[PDB]
């Protein structure tokens, strides 16, 4: 539920600054 | 059901795993959902699951933080489930732990924890472990009290607390700060081989002993001093918890007479104890040299006592050992027999990724300023190995200290960790510590895929498929080659004008392929006629075999034969003392080790016929000088990096510069550049390569290949019809 | 406040401590003037400041000389003081160290103090430690005794005693004919690449062990035979103060 | 004062008479 689509969204943008 | 294999991650995310998109739908989550994962001894962790193209369908990816946690280790297997009603917390409480916070005081929130915590939305289990990295110091933390119960994620809201004495580590939990399989960079290919060689049966071994197939008993590792030899036979030990015993020369061989040998002795006898073990021999060149460089009685009892003891590896069940060493054949040739030390693998020198990787792993702890680029450094360092760049980051790491420490002028027993923290490396303390930096392996080999590509090559649009037909086809579709009868070609020689790109045609199909390329350039070969020492054509052809799949390059093949005159020559005839070893190793290489054999020469008129025999460089392939639409291409390929005025017009210069070799082109275009930057420094005493600078370097730029030499070439390829 | 930091001096004059110009404007300082300088153990050194074109400007460039008599090395800190009411004295009793005057006799004012002190107008203060070089010796002595106090600058009228026996030389107070930095004359570029590699885990201990970057511990030198391999490995040990152990 | 002044003049003086 939303705690875990906040999780969702900070675990995503994370991964993406060390893929770039 | 949902039990999935534990696999390492890329990913280095202490609150999220990697699960491949199919397993999402069995599992019935969504991308970043959060999930429960089971462990042993009826403990649990909860992370954030992500997807990727990378992860094995049946596998989960996850690193070291969250595998102590699970106490799990790689090849376990774990249970997955969703847990969709996830809370937040309000309270939690982190104390550090004893082990990993000594020597630095300060507020360890405002420093670690806060930027760990804060808007991360990190689930968190009461009883996790998890490491903070920071000030050039690893401190993990334990969470010990949370109101709610038993896991919850933070909140932007959520308060942590941290307030007592640190806490004891427990016996059976290992420190996050030891050495495991991600502290390891570049060398990648020989960790797997080496994982799959002894992981089996130490941490299955119940499965070799109730078969009738016997494990490998001895591994020996080799290559330059500071490669990883050692930091590898740790992470294997430390990742499968197998018992480690440390040996080295100079320990075993500082003793006396009778003292020497019984250390050696006690050693495996102490793994066979605690087995499964691991036995790693450091420096085994000191215990064990070649028989025939001692004559000592010390050294030469040594050598039969650790023969004796490998041998009783047949009864020492579960029990590995490890060594490490220089070079295969500077040990007693009877290690390497059958049994004893019987597997070998050569971790070589990290290549221009490895080196990026190792400099990426040396800098965890350390604040690095938006200007530093270590992909850059990386390229810079030619030469080094692991233990170079190690020094160069702690060289860089000092000279930043000194820079702050003289001007904030605190000097007490422990140091504050926001100096620390708020320390950041700049790109001029790496830049010198690079020119402090002294490359250990300066002189040593270069094996390694070539970043040459296809598309770095002008023109020669037939020669590129030809190559692929030689080098792939024959791995490739090799049931077709058994079914036609063909025997596959060893190898291509090429002839034609110089620069015109017989190397970069060897790099381009070798990087293709993924296949370390091996470069022989003519000083070398003439470094071995010259001083008799042709032998040593061996042990290239040895290290192509070491190093395959790969592609072993010839360039200057007629180098020799220039020196003995070239167009007259001397008393004797074609063959030589090095044309002749490398006959003979082609001669005795298979085309099942998948090594490919590649020359060059500008006077294919004095190459010894017997190089292009059946069996050795029996294709010929011409690279003529290139015409005009590869000269545009050409010219491309070369200015691909350069800031290029608009106002060039590539295509004129190709049609000018109609007798040109690439290498001449490259020479307008590097003369161009040059003028460019000299105006450019004038200007500050511009922005783009301008018009005005090649047709100044049409000035001076000439064609190196006369027509006298182009018919050379045209009567050769006529000759070969 | 004023706190700079130590380095080395190209003046071997024990009287001359070297500022930067913008430094003498910070202090409210003329060219010449007579400061303190404050040091460890309460305790401090009267000097005259001058002004070059090389001192860099955070630091204080001083000699082995001063820095001995404030108990401090190089890449300490200490501060610098005016002290604009400076006057010169009537009399100064020196009497030489018992480990320095040994197997030569004489008139030690006429031969050592008297060129030393006539009409230098050095400053001076009670407990100074200062060298005098002359007849292929080297011979140090301390200031004992003198009418004004704390310190006073030499007058041409100021007179010069010497009488009593010499000084037992304290187990604290290091000899100034020991190796030190200024001792070593070419190869000055290999000299600051040790120093740097050394004198900051051996002054700041604290650091290393506080810190995940590991330091140095290692250094070959090499070079033919009499080039100062030793005399460097010694000026390093007797400057920062770590135990020297030779093999 | 003054007799900082007299120090002065020596001690550039001296300097002077070593640098050249
Ligand atoms: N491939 C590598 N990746 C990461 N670090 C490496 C690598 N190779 C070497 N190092 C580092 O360099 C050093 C190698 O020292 P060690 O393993 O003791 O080698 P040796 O057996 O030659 O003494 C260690 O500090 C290690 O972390
Ligand atoms: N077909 C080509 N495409 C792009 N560059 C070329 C080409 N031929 C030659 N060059 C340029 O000439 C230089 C020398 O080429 P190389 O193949 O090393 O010569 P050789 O094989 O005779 O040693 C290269 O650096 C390259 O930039
Ligand atoms: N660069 C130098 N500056 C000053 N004196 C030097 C220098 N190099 C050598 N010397 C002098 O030469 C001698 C060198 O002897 P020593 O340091 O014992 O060298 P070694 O290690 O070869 O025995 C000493 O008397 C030393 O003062």
């Not at chain 2, 040594?302 to 590995?320: E, F, N, P, W, Y």
């Not at chain 2, 605190?410 to 510590?433: K, P, Q, Y």
């Not at chain 2, 020359?599 to 000088?625: V, W």
């Amino acid at each position: 539920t939303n705690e875990a689509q906040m999780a969702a969204a900070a675990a995503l943008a994370r991964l993406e600054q060390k893929q770039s | 059901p949902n039990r999935l294999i534990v696999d390492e991650a890329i990913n280095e995310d202490n609150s999220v795993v990697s699960l491949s998109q199919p397993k999402m739908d069995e599992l019935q989550l969504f991308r970043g959902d959060t999930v429960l994962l089971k462990g042993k001894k009826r403990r649990e962790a909860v992370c954030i699951v992500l997807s990727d193209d990378t992860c094995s369908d049946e596998k989960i990816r996850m690193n070291r933080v969250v595998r102590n946690n699970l106490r799990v280790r790689l090849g376990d297997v774990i249970s997955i489930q969703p847990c969709p009603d996830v809370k937040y917390g309000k309270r939690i409480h982190v104390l550090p732990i004893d082990d990993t916070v000594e020597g630095i005081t300060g507020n360890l929130f405002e420093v670690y924890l806060k930027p760990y915590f804060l808007e991360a939305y990190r689930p968190i289990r009461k009883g996790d472990i998890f490491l903070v990295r920071g000030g050039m110091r690893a401190v993990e933390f334990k969470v010990v009290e949370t109101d709610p119960s038993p896991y919850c994620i933070v909140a932007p809201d959520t308060v942590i607390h941290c307030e007592g004495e640190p806490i004891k580590r427990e016996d059976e939990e290992e420190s996050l700060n030891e050495v495991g399989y991600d502290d390891i960079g570049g060398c990648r290919k020989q960790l797997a081989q080496i994982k799959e060689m002894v992981e089996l049966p130490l941490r299955h071994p119940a499965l070799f002993k109730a078969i009738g197939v016997k494990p490998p008993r001895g591994i020996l590792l080799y290559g330059p001093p500071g490669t990883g030899k050692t930091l590898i036979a740790r992470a294997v030990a430390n990742e499968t918890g197998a018992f480690f015993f440390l040996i080295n020369g100079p320990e075993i061989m500082s003793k006396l007479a009778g003292e020497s040998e019984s250390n050696l002795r006690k050693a495996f006898e102490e793994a066979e104890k605690n087995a499964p073990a691991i036995i790693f021999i450091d420096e085994l060149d000191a215990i064990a040299p070649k028989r025939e460089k001692t004559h000592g009685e010390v050294e030469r009892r040594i050598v039969s006592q650790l023969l004796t003891l490998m041998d009783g590896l047949k009864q020492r069940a579960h029990v590995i050992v490890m060594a490490a060493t220089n070079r295969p054949n500077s040990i007693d040739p009877a290690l390497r027999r059958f049994g004893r030390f019987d597997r070998e693998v050569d971790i070589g020198i990290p290549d221009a990724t490895g080196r990026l990787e190792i400099l990426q792993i040396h800098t965890k702890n350390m604040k690095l300023a938006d200007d530093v680029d270590l992909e850059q450094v990386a390229n810079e360092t030619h030469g080094h190995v692991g233990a170079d760049l190690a020094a160069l980051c702690s060289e860089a790491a000092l000279q930043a200290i000194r820079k702050k420490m003289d001007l904030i002028d605190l000097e007490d027993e422990t140091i504050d960790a926001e100096v620390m923290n708020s320390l950041a490396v700049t790109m001029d303390d790496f830049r010198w510590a690079l020119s402090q930096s002294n490359p250990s392996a300066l002189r040593e080999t270069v094996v390694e895929v070539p970043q040459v590509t296809w598309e770095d090559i002008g023109g020669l649009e037939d020669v590129k498929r030809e190559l692929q037909e030689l080098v792939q086809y024959p791995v490739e579709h090799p049931d077709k080659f058994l079914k036609f009868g063909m025997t596959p070609s060893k190898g291509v020689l090429f002839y034609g004008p110089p620069g015109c790109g017989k190397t970069l045609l060897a790099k381009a199909i070798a990087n293709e392929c993924q296949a370390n390329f091996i470069s022989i350039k003519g000083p070398e070969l003439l470094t071995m006629w010259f001083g008799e020492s042709e032998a040593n054509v061996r042990e290239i052809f040895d290290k192509a075999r070491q190093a395959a799949p790969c592609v072993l390059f010839f360039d200057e093949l007629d180098s020799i034969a220039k020196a003995r005159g070239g167009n007259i020559g001397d008393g004797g005839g074609a063959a030589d003392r090095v044309i002749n070893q490398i006959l003979t190793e082609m001669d005795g290489m298979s085309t099942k080790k998948n090594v490919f054999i590649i020359g060059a020469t500008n006077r294919p008129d004095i190459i010894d016929p017997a190089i292009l025999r059946p069996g050795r460089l029996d294709q010929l392939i011409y690279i003529p000088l290139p015409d005009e639409k590869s000269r545009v291409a050409i010219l491309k390929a070369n200015l691909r990096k350069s800031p290029v005025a608009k106002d060039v017009d590539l295509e004129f210069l190709a049609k000018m510069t109609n007798g040109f070799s690439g290498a001449d082109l490259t020479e307008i275009c590097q003369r161009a550049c040059k003028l460019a930057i000299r105006e450019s420094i004038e200007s500050e005493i511009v922005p783009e390569i301008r018009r005005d600078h090649f047709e100044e370097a049409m000035r001076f730029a000439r064609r190196s290949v006369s027509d006298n030499d182009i018919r050379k070439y045209e009567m050769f390829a006529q000759t070969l019809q």
